[PDB]
Design an enzyme around this catalytic site. Structure first.
Site, PDB file in Angstrom:
ATOM      1  N   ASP A 134      -7.690   8.552  12.780  1.00  0.00           N
ATOM      2  CA  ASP A 134      -7.187   7.221  12.494  1.00  0.00           C
ATOM      3  C   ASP A 134      -5.767   7.007  12.992  1.00  0.00           C
ATOM      4  O   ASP A 134      -4.815   7.603  12.492  1.00  0.00           O
ATOM      5  CB  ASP A 134      -7.269   6.945  10.993  1.00  0.00           C
ATOM      6  CG  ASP A 134      -6.754   5.571  10.623  1.00  0.00           C
ATOM      7  OD1 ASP A 134      -5.585   5.265  10.933  1.00  0.00           O
ATOM      8  OD2 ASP A 134      -7.517   4.798  10.010  1.00  0.00           O
ATOM      9  N   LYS A 143       0.821  -1.218   0.000  1.00  0.00           N
ATOM     10  CA  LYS A 143       0.000   0.000   0.000  1.00  0.00           C
ATOM     11  C   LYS A 143       0.857   1.270   0.000  1.00  0.00           C
ATOM     12  O   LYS A 143       0.403   2.327  -0.462  1.00  0.00           O
ATOM     13  CB  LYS A 143      -0.968   0.010   1.192  1.00  0.00           C
ATOM     14  CG  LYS A 143      -2.110   1.010   1.037  1.00  0.00           C
ATOM     15  CD  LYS A 143      -2.745   1.292   2.368  1.00  0.00           C
ATOM     16  CE  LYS A 143      -4.205   1.616   2.264  1.00  0.00           C
ATOM     17  NZ  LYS A 143      -4.862   1.511   3.589  1.00  0.00           N
ATOM     18  N   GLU A 160     -11.498   5.671   3.034  1.00  0.00           N
ATOM     19  CA  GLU A 160     -11.618   5.013   4.327  1.00  0.00           C
ATOM     20  C   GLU A 160     -12.359   5.889   5.319  1.00  0.00           C
ATOM     21  O   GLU A 160     -13.195   5.405   6.081  1.00  0.00           O
ATOM     22  CB  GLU A 160     -10.239   4.611   4.849  1.00  0.00           C
ATOM     23  CG  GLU A 160      -9.621   3.449   4.087  1.00  0.00           C
ATOM     24  CD  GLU A 160      -8.111   3.406   4.194  1.00  0.00           C
ATOM     25  OE1 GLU A 160      -7.543   4.271   4.884  1.00  0.00           O
ATOM     26  OE2 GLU A 160      -7.490   2.513   3.585  1.00  0.00           O
TER      27      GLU A 160
END
Ligand SMILES: Cc1ccc2c(N)ncnc2c1
EC number: 3.6.4.10
Lengths: 104, 381
Positions: free
Chosen positions: B199, B71, B175
């Protein structure tokens, strides 16, 4: 004074002792093949296996570390130290194999 | 196998997760090992290819040919600064192939190269398989998540992974947006809502501000630290312990990789315990040179050891408010995502900054983005 609670811990340790006996058998086979060669390419094939045996022993120590034992649980505490000393001795055997194989 | 429903897949840096919507509820599917999250790891051995727990569990045995953090590479050019900086830390080889990065491994005796989206497809394949084993039906349709900052290249390279895996990517969603869906932020009566998604987890820190009007989600600002996570908290516990062993025994265990690992594994269990308990006990028999290590850690001490890191999570929040041109009083909702937001101090710091505003944490912070992604998959079914 022997408690039913201690039996639960002792059984966890008995399973771990049995897992170590399984890994120890793999190491005995490994030692025998290494002794066999010592009687290059064959040695880096043993590398993959000794590294896996090392890891299996490292994962056992990690599992043993999750146990917190009351001082009162004397028999379990003694069984734990024994098993850790037993595994560490096997890890030194591992290191001997590793230091002999894949040498330039 | 019969035709199955659409699933939600959270494709993450260090771990992936898959969820399905059945019987008016989201179910996070557990894998072969029984885990609700699967590591984003792919190993190439002399005999096979391992994905998830099997690949991660053998990283110590085969460090060079075990790939993770795809990623961080996906959709990026080789000369990109992140790629150059990040590769200085991986045990695996990253090569330049006509301006693009590729990871070089040894698979079944041959030297092979894979593009980041090829490695991601292998992880998405495992998520699809995890979902099929649970449902007993074939899964194809899925919603896959991406971070709000991914550019056109990074978004498409992910869509490409879904395609290579054999998935029908119903939608690609941010997300942060999927975190708002999970808590039904869009379905809230009234005017436009300013939402901050906090996050902290999966080795990255991401602050996101979004405003939703008429069921529309708009990213007004993204901020954070790309290398801050749970593992940073762990090092501080490990150092504290290494120095404690030096004080109590005058021996350095730092140079012994096995001693340090036994200690690290024990610190991860302790940090987790300190999320629900005010103290964690550690009992390691024969840690180094035959010395037993019996110690304990307070929640207070853990917090003091990471005070700079914890406070520092608020600078990003400030940076994002300035960019979105919003006051802290203008934030309608605060959403916590990632495991490291389970830490009581991070929660306290964030609630105090927002002058006592209650935070959205009911849904498992590791499963939050995948929950929403599964809600969206049901809607598109
Ligand atoms: C219970 C639990 C799980 C996970 C974590 C975590 N990842 N970081 C901090 N605290 C935690 C606590």
């Amino acid at each position: 004074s022997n408690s039913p609670q201690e039996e639960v811990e002792l059984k966890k340790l008995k399973h771990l002792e049995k897992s170590v006996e399984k890994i120890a058998d793999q190491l005995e086979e490994l030692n025998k093949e290494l002794t066999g060669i010592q009687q290059a390419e064959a040695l880096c094939k043993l590398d993959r296996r000794v590294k896996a045996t090392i890891e299996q022993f490292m994962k056992i120590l990690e599992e043993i570390d999750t146990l917190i034992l009351p001082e009162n649980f004397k028999d379990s505490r003694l069984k734990r130290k024994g098993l850790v000393k037993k595994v560490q001795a096997f890890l030194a055997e591992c290191d001997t194999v590793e230091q002999n194989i894949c040498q330039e | 196998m019969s035709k199955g429903p659409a699933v939600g897949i959270d494709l993450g840096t260090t771990y992936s997760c898959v969820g399905v919507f059945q019987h008016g509820k989201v179910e996070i599917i557990a894998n072969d090992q029984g885990n609700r999250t699967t590591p984003s790891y792919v190993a190439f051995t002399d005999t096979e290819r391992l994905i998830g727990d099997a690949a991660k569990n053998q990283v110590a045995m085969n460090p060079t040919n075990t790939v993770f953090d795809a990623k961080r590479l996906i959709g990026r050019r080789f000369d990109d600064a992140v790629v150059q900086s990040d590769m200085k830390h991986w045990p695996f080889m990253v090569v330049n192939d006509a301006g693009r990065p590729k990871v070089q491994v040894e698979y079944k005796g041959e030297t092979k190269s894979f593009y980041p989206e090829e490695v991601s497809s292998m992880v998405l394949t495992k998520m699809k398989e995890i979902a099929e084993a649970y449902l007993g039906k074939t899964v194809t349709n899925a919603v896959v998540t991406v971070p709000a900052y991914f550019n056109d290249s990074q978004r498409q390279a992910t869509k490409d992974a879904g395609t290579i895996a054999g998935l029908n990517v119903l939608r690609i969603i941010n997300e942060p947006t999927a975190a708002a869906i999970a808590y039904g932020l869009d379905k809230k009566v009234g005017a436009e809502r300013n939402v901050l998604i906090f996050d902290l987890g999966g080795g990255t820190f991401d602050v996101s501000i979004l405003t939703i009007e008429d069921g529309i989600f708009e990213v007004k600002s993204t901020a954070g630290d790309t290398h801050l996570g749970g593992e940073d908290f762990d090092n501080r516990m490990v150092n504290h312990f290494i120095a404690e062993f030096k004080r109590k025994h005058k021996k350095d265990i730092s140079e012994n990789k096995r001693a340090v690992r036994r200690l690290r594994t024990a610190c991860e269990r302790a940090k987790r315990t300190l999320s629900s308990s005010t103290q964690a006990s550690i009992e390691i028999d024969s840690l180094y040179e035959g010395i037993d290590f019996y110690t304990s850690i307070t929640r207070a001490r853990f917090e003091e050891l990471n005070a700079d890191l914890f406070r520092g999570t608020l600078d990003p929040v400030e940076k994002a408010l300035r960019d979105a041109k919003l006051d802290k009083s203008q934030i309608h909702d605060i959403v916590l995502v990632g495991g490291s937001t389970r830490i009581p101090k991070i929660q306290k710091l964030l609630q105090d900054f927002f002058n006592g505003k209650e935070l959205n944490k009911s849904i498992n912070p590791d499963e939050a983005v995948a929950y929403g992604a599964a809600v969206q998959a049901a809607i598109l079914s």
